Amino acid sequence: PHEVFVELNELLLDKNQEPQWRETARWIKFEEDVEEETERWGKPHVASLSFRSLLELRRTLAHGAVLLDLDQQTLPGVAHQVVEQMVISDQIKAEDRANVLRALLLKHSHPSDKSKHELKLLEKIPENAEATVVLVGCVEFLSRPTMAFVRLREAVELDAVLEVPVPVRFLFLLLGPSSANMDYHEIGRSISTLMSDKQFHEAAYLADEREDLLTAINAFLDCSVVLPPSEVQGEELLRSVAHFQRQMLKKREEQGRDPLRRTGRPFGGLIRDVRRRYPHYLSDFRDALDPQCLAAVIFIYFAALSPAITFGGLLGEKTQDLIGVSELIMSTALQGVVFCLLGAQPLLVIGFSGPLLVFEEAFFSFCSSNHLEYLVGRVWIGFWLVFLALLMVALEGSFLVRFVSRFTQEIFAFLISLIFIYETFYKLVKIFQEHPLHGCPRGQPNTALLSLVLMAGTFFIAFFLRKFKNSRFFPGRIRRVIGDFGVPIAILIMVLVDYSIEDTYTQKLSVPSGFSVTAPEKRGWVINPLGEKSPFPVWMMVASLLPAILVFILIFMETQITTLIISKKERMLQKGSGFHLDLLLIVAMGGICALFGLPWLAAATVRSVTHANALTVMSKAVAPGDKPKIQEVKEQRVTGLLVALLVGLSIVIGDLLRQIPLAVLFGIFLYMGVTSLNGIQFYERLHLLLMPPKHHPDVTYVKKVRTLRMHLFTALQLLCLALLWAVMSTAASLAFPFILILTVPLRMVVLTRIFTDREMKCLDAN
Template structure:
């Protein structure tokens, strides 16, 4: 590192090739004593003057000017999958033709242990949201659609989508705006005395038809206007919601299993909690069970007698809850008997699952065990964390809340079937009136589906099999219509689940040089993982005995892990860190090379403001207009042209991956340096001589053409080496103090590596 040239090369090197080139150049220039015995009496006198190192900084060049490489196109240019065809279903036909050649490989490429780890992780991650969404939907619709319908709908839609879609890496799930839409629709039906399932079926069918119309007209090509600004705001919002809701569910457990703050050790023997009948007692008091979504009555109590208090006092907790009973006593909390340690144990399970998943995921970077073992542990990170926490929970025996899966394959309500009449008991005009709410629903489905698809199809994922925006929307529309006829929930692309799916299938180089980071090679593009996730989900009705051992806090910890891990790689959060980071410690982000820091902060603040607005809408009753607000971000981005130049926006909001941008810029800089070096060498060639000043004041002029060059490569001439071979140069080498080129090119002398 004491060598000036190699010191600069080492600090400016972009990859190992630059570093190796610097080492080779140093070894070429350094004076090395040959091996052998050394006579101490022999002394090497220091040179009279140290040769200039400037010539070593010049890159080697062949004769003439090298041809200029075509600069890589920057900016967002729509690929063939987003170009309008001008024909009905032209984009859909193109997507099918693009995906058919890859169909068999979509299953052959799944022959990997990493795919098994991926679908086991995503199965556990998808189960809880589907069942929770079904439970919330059951509360909002009086059990017209509940957990079992949600489970079957997710399984059926996911299987079809994973087999025939254009991008099988996308995972379908439930969304918040859909739930808000269902709540509003049910209230309207109750208010006007309409059949909820029939009207919902009409709206779903119209939405399906409108989505098919968007497919026919190649409307998916409009996603080319969704830039990094919009997609990062949307993805950040969904990730933050996952993190927030996982913590919120943990806090909610504190209400169901509170801490007894008034507990006194001396009064432990006096604690009691008994079940008492409700105020308005009748022989048939129905209460929907929160565990298995069925309704039971008080006559289920063995030996039931409304006037017999002993029966109520001896009832179990589940029997008391099913019969509208209440818990009374010093050992009772708000609505349930006091159960010690549950809340604290749930907190431990929650954070232990998150940290254990993170630790296992980073296990491949450790120095223990062989490479294959480390890679396998990293691939099965989340699944291993879930197994560990389930085992510990089972061993300790603390009654933590568990996952409850419906165990009966039939509709939740007995007064409905698996097929819904679109008209039913409603007036005929409701079929036509359903067009208006279906417009809102269509925008909701289109925006959720396509923004997630844009995020999954990012260039930095290095997908090789192409995508299919039109084909994806086609199957979402078809399954939406089928689910409407069957009275099942609607499902669309889920952002965080899809990002987690892609992250779990990343492929990196297996071997690398010591100290070198593994290279990202791409994604395992296949259909097996999505197919198995939703196949197991459909079979979960028959796996209730095994699934009942999974603690809910463990699944909440998985949600937290997915939300946090999905934030990695989002440029918006990298720019947020710059607010508290001194300039000298800022990373070498490509946009910091070309955009002033104040403009970067302004761009980040605008994006942060839009994110806060989306959060405010998403978490309120106005969530139904959320897709329209996401669409409004496209227009906000258009207005930003007034505050930023096109050049600044091309660096801050471009869809080209940052790593690729850096590579392009480094290549362009290298080309410019080579062009300048070639220009200087051509100037020397035009003058025709190299002048060498002698001690006596005389000047030796050597014609450049008289310098011999190596016959190995006649296109390359190294002036310094060839001059050193001439007899004239050897005769004058002891007298010459230094050498320089003619005055007009004196400032930029040719290097040892430069060539004409």
């Protein structure tokens, strides 16, 4: 039981007709060949071998010389024993001993003739592996081909046969005349592909006699596929060539023979989470002393600051400056420090979200249309939120996230993107009416077109940098670093361009100077739950439960979905999960912060995923040609605390934030809206509605389902989304969380009634 590294050496004249042994190929997991006219290693590929070479090898292996459990530790002795066994096996006469022995002892040469190559290659080779050398060559002083196979008792590192220091266990000799129409390079390639797979080398390990090696090659042959002699193009191999192998292998092997659970005790989930996460406390403050940790704070800081200022600008221009940039910054800083010191999943980034923005819009519209204070109703909403969070934590109910499937999540994401796009286009439509494009802040000449130019420029700069991040240019290290700084670069470039122009007027941000409210003449710092100016009605202190339930539904959905996605198993997350503590902390802080007139926050799934990806380390000991794998994720609660502190210390520099026009922020808004459409399995199904059935891909939800049924599924999803969008534009746009809550069981019951069970496993895969 070991791992094998195989290398093929051939007898080829180097420069001055000296014989020389030259390396030609190398097998770790996949074959790599050396180009003859360039002398450099090619790309890895599947070792495809002919069938005549296999028969020639099988024919010649029967008459070969076999030596088992040899006791030599140097090439002299091994070669002498091999020659003696050859001459006593009636393969060569007693006159060719000297010439064959001379041919055996020569100088091996390699293309990369411990330097950098050995250090780099020893990483990709497994930790403790044993090596094989295949020596094949054409000899003009022989009559018939001769073969020898040896297995050493103890692994021995030979002097220079191999390019790297790996102990050698197996040797293969094949010398013969150029006649008999035999291709020795192909036979060597066949032997090296034989010795580089698990079954054959395991069978060769406990091999006692000659014919035990013929059974192994017979078993190798009845496990492979055969391709007929005809092909034209390259998309014909993307088909079953990879599916046929898996199906046949599964047939061979088949014929060859939690943090989400109701306990029953009150607050059981809290106790389990606290006793699972908190013991490993001092570790989270120690694994932060790494270069990667301090290189992730900057990008996370920018990615958390840009949406904060954008959403603050939109809220300030919409909420009559009751809540603006300063208040969002204070809420993000205050609630990002407490969570990262007490929460059980410090990889979540707490911030504002689109659904919360549209709910605030709807509640403001409700309050204005009925002449009620907007900041004293939020206090009672927060109180009821605190009560609701306590009650569901008390009776474990976080298992309800298991009932939310892809069907609802994709509708949610699509609606969020649509409202972002609508907001951006509404803003520019409104710009062109304040400043009409007539002849020679109500009549400025060059404002509307310059706003359009800024918005388009900041979009098109971030688009072609997200594109560049995914490309193949530059070193991979630097490409990843530069491609990680797209939005700040676009914002800085557009701000500099706008600052160069010193004649035209454009709207700017409204951040104030020092620790102050955005509207000091309107509100103070604490909102008394009895009425700022007029007394609050006594019938709304009780009837504020419904908006509390709706906002709780929104917060629960986003936070629990984020915690589900982050805690997947493919990501090596080992410390634990916070399904019950995170929700309690988030909702309690959201309820308390409403007393001071600050907004509610959520989990911010995309930012959390970005933060999780910037702390992963990829294993470098991966053989060429296989995909990279996650080594581990560095979990700690220092980077989140630092980001929360840094976001808070952005009011003291509010002088540099007043030079930023609103058009740049709305361009970044639209860029975030369009880019989020990727990754949801509803956008491509909607793309499939316009292509002919010949061009549909080979994804799992296409091969198993007829076209019309898939189109029916997509039509039902579109109908649900359109019904959700109709309610939002009316004067009763305080029920869309209820509409999603309705589309959950509607989905279950009705779509179970219509579609079969087999179809709802590919169209609605978990």
